[PDB]
A paper describes a structure:
The proteasome, a huge protein complex responsible for ubiquitin-dependent proteolysis in eukaryotic cells, is composed of a 20S core particle, which serves as a proteolytic chamber, and one or two regulatory particles. The core particle consists of two α- and two β-rings, which form a cylindrical, four-layered αββα structure. The α-ring is composed of seven homologous but distinct subunits, α1–7, that are arranged into a hetero-heptameric structure in the order α1-α2-α3-α4-α5-α6-α7 with assistance of assembly chaperones. Among human proteasome α subunits, α7 exhibits a unique feature of in vitro self-assembly into a homo-tetradecamer with a double ring structure.
First, we determined the crystal structure of the human α7 tetradecamer at 3.75-Å resolution. The α7 tetradecamer exhibited an hourglass double-ring shape, which is consistent with the previously reported negative staining electron micrographs and small-angle neutron scattering (SANS) data. The two α rings interact with each other mainly through two α helices that are involved in β-subunit interaction in the 20S proteasome. The conformations of the individual protomers and their quaternary arrangement in each ring of the human α7 tetradecamer are essentially identical with those observed in the homo-heptameric α-ring in archaeal proteasomes and the hetero-heptameric α-ring in mammalian proteasomes. The SV-AUC data showed that the α7 subunit exclusively exists as a single species with a sedimentation coefficient of 14.2 S, which is in excellent agreement with that estimated from the crystal structure (14.4 S), confirming the double-ring structure of this complex in solution. The mass spectrum of α7 under non-denaturing conditions exhibited ion series indicating a complex with a molecular mass of 405,879 ± 81 Da. This confirms the homo-tetradecameric structure of this subunit (with a calculated mass of 28,284 Da, based on its amino acid sequence). Although a detailed comparison of the inter-subunit interaction modes was difficult because of the low resolution of the present crystal structure, the model clearly shows that α6 makes steric hindrances at the inter-subunit interface, thereby explaining why α6 is not able to form the homo-heptameric ring as α7 does. All these data indicate that α6 interacts with α7, disassembling one mole of the tetradecameric double-ring of α7 and thereby give rise to two moles of the 1:7 hetero-octameric α6–α7 complex. In summary, the present study demonstrates that the proteasome α6 subunit acts as a breaker of the α7 double-ring structure.
Author numbering:
A (entry chain C): 1 to 40, 44 to 203, 212 to 245
B (entry chain B): 1 to 245
C (entry chain A): 2 to 245
D (entry chain J): 1 to 204, 211 to 245
E (entry chain I), F (entry chain K): 1 to 244
């Protein structure tokens, strides 16, 4: 089913068996990007491929803040993701203008999804070539993790995984007992699973950080990195 | 993978294996242009450009592939020059409609982020092609330090210690990997730039070439200036000499 | 002959990284007759290989040397309808200067603006780009003498002298010979009209007239046409140094 | 100089001796409101307000004459309260439509400058009156340090070490002149604030953090420290 | 201080001693209207209104000075009734153009804040007068608990444990100060309301009067309902009796 | 001529003897503000301001009656400060929406001309009052030399060698008439400024005062800077002494 004739050149075009091929292709732009995962506070990690030595450190970043209290973790076509981050930024801001406090992640996800989906109907554009996840903690709402794909679908999650191996990395998170564990524990078990899955970057948010989504300090990375390298040998 | 049928005539069109071919092609408009590079000393940033004397008849200070965007920001461009000049205008307005409101200079981080927004905007849609140019922005102030950014046709903003765009991307980047840029002063770097241009330049297939050069640092108050002719001719000479070898 | 697809829209990069529909627009300039412009030390001079396409014509129709302002002259090659429209754009642009800013427009900038504009037609599928190159030349005393050339792709180039059309190539190697930085404008008009006659194809093109342009300290800053004395005299000088 | 004929009914009307009376009157709407003050420690800024229990029936945390505008900015207001609350909304949006674009927090310098722009806008025109309120904005981060600003009805933004708006402006300012605010820590200051409220109050309290003390967050002052500082004021009063 | 000359004909006009008289006058439109009050039990909120039978000819459930704004929000109004009804509409839209987007119910805190924004908007300008009405909003859900707010003509939103607007503001508020509202259940309160209406009512100068009454609490799921006739007539009776 | 009836309440109203009184009144808003002056050396321009320490409690570098509008332009203001700050914003945008397009710095001639346009715009109409402030703009580059301009409420732009706005206009101007400003260097001038502030200042009726001071020249690259504290305190002292 390299279906396509015609059927796969526009988002404005259903295939006969009932499929918008140009979206599926947008999803395959996520597949060809490196793996990145997130798991419930909430923790994100990313298989960030040192494409060069010449880089800045803290360029590149595939873990954003959208707000103070929200983090974004992206996979696929990075230019697009950054623009979608901007959209989330505005959306969570034009909240606080009016409604006084922080935006609920449920809803912010719902909105930015609205937006992503908007690009799947029409012939004058292609859809976005990126998935991403949003993660937040406050105490009123608890811990929350969401994932949006190119087709514009917002999914709540206990943990998930996007990119090169989606598939491998998800079966590995199925193993863990995420509901129980503390955030401090998890960062290890993340970095494990990146290294497991990698074919031969890290993110807080929780009660652990006040509600602030921070980067993971270098102590804990290097230590958790090491723990991954070691439980690898096996 | 001359992929394309259909899949490579619009920016509105993903290939099946998940690729916007018309952007990649826009990137290959940068490749066919001459090399240009930029690189971050500890007290600032330096740009140089393999500027191919396409004629003798030219003005000097036409041609220029090193702009000021502001006083304190410099732009260094490669690929399709008409496009770049327009993108420069966009950066100009953006860094201006800053100072109107926000009072002082624009942060390079952000300006890059904005002009990137813009470049990316041309990658989604069928009624245009994307821009056929990469470029780099460099600034110094003392509060922010030295800063170097590179945007490509696909609209991605990258921070850098040094980078290189055009004919040899590839050769010129492996040569900057050698240098110890974090340490060195800007005054030193201008030499080591002009070396690498001359290293990488093709004597055979490209003809004669001039060389264009760019300051910004604590060395120049924060002002992005052109490099005075003393220092060019001297650094040019140093390149010619360490070439023979 | 790349093209399939790749060459029917300005909205379409070729795979090897090329907007073919612009290059084709440039080839509309090539098939037009030669025209050149060249910077003396006290000003700028334009000449045009204006092919008497008929005897029936008005004189001072046809004109491939415009005024855009008082102080700016335009010299065009390729698809003439387009050029005339671009002239209008330059006219407005240099005018909506003086409204506000009080004095004359700087050529640097005017060129930069009209270029902006030409380039605007190279990105999009609902139009083709302009099928014409042209040069702008001015003098004042504050700015000195200035010469610019814009091509279809929307690139503004400063120049000491340049040449657009049938032979670009021949006519440029001929201006390389001259010592333009030194010479006075009065001298140059000769050496122009020489080079038109040098380059002109006697065989394949038929008869031809010649059109000619001042601007310098020689003319106050005003871009004028070259008076008929100096044409017929410089025309003659070309005819003579031809025989050789 | 009850000047006015004509000269004092519009913001569109200069008096002959060169005065926009309708603004000065808007300032006198601040005077008739209760006192409120704010003052810059070395590690942050502190606000207090002579909040007159107009009733027992109230909510607690209604009424509030100390807002958050952002997380990191606090507002402290005096005069005509309906207006202030609307100006707070303006500040809110302004500091938000920052973070949308420019990525981080808004600089207080500038936010003040903006919201001032806005207040001044109401002073020129005949179809409106100007705002009947002064207010102060206070913030801390570490990059910018501690910062305190005051805008009045006429739309003027002033930086300050400490200031005071309302019933006694005048009394309360001469009292802050005494203190050594540049030196002191924020923890110390809250006392010396609440003192000065009680000094100035006519016999015949709400409180505000921001500093390194609170991460950069403008919080309300916890009840420990109020009741303790309140007590300290009551005591050094007797004298 | 019948101040006014000039100073009191526009909302665009500060008095010299620093006062927008035309708002204070709008507040005095509330005073000349009959009393109405609202008061926060621990499991919800209750409203009652001294509704003056201006005629026998009326519909019953015309007149109504207790609205629903939403399902879960109730409004209780005093002063100039035409205005109030329009402000209700504004609250209606505002709490609706919530649920469109944000999914669930509107928080009373905020809805009050918004509609206040709006009321205040009418206090600045010369081409209008402000609204001639106060009102109170009351809601319960379980997440937010019980909530009571009051907005006056000047556009100020106040949170409350209980309050009172109209003929006697003053009398009725001192009476609610007596009660222990934080403790009591909603079922208890409705009595103690209807008491205070009857206490405050002027037997001499006002004639006969009906009584209107309002639920919201855990008692009603979150729904603001009218108080069923059992409980009115029973609480009405209890008021009549503790009167004597 | 307290003329006014009618004639002096609107900018839309000529007096019968031919006068827009509401502008003249706007000018008298400048008079009641403290003095500030500016004066053109041969290598640049210098501003100083009789800045009345209205309190001890202030920030230092609040208050500022000397702005940067650009890097290369400085503004010095007198009268109604809220207005001035808004006019500064206008100048800021205007000199910015230059560099966007025209590539380099804005010419002071023109910037003044523009912002003036604007100030004048407020003198015709009944729905506004004009601005209650004068100000001066000063710049140096090498191409244009040193330049000093003053705009008053009526919207008139004036070039100057030196000028003075506020409490004593009059005193301070007769004092600058003394100096030989065309000759002198900027370094010299800052003294002679701060002299004239102190000369003119009223010791009786105004209390203490600070002093604010402003560079621009070849002395500072073209940058308008504040005057470093060395040179202030030293020039302040020189003023105090030649006072006695």
């Amino acid at each position: 089913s390299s279906i396509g004739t015609g059927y796969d050149l526009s988002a404005s075009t259903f295939s006969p068996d009932g499929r918008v091929f140009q979206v599926e292709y947008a999803m395959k732009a996520v597949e060809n990007s490196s793996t990145a995962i997130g798991i419930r506070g909430v923790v994100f990690g990313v298989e960030k491929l040192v494409l060069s030595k010449l880089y800045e450190e803290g360029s590149n970043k595939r873990l954003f803040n959208v707000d103070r209290h929200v983090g974004m973790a992206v996979a696929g076509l990075l230019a697009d993701a950054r623009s979608l981050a901007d959209i989330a930024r505005e959306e969570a801001s034009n909240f606080r203008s009016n409604f006084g406090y922080n935006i609920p992640l449920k809803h912010l996800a719902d909105r930015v999804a609205m937006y992503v989906h908007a690009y799947t109907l029409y012939s004058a554009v292609r859809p976005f070539g990126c998935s991403f996840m949003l993660g937040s903690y406050s105490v009123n709402d608890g811990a929350q993790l969401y994932m949006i794909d190119p087709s514009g679908v917002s999914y709540g999650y206990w943990g998930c995984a996007i990119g090169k191996a989606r598939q491998a990395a998800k079966t590995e998170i199925e193993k863990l007992q995420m509901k129980e564990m503390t955030c401090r524990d998890i960062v290890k078990e993340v970095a494990k699973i990146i290294y497991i899955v990698h074919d031969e970057e890290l993110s807080w948010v929780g009660e652990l950080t006040n509600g602030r989504h921070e980067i993971v300090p270098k102590d804990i990375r290097e230590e958790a990195e090491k723990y991954a390298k070691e439980s690898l040998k096996e």
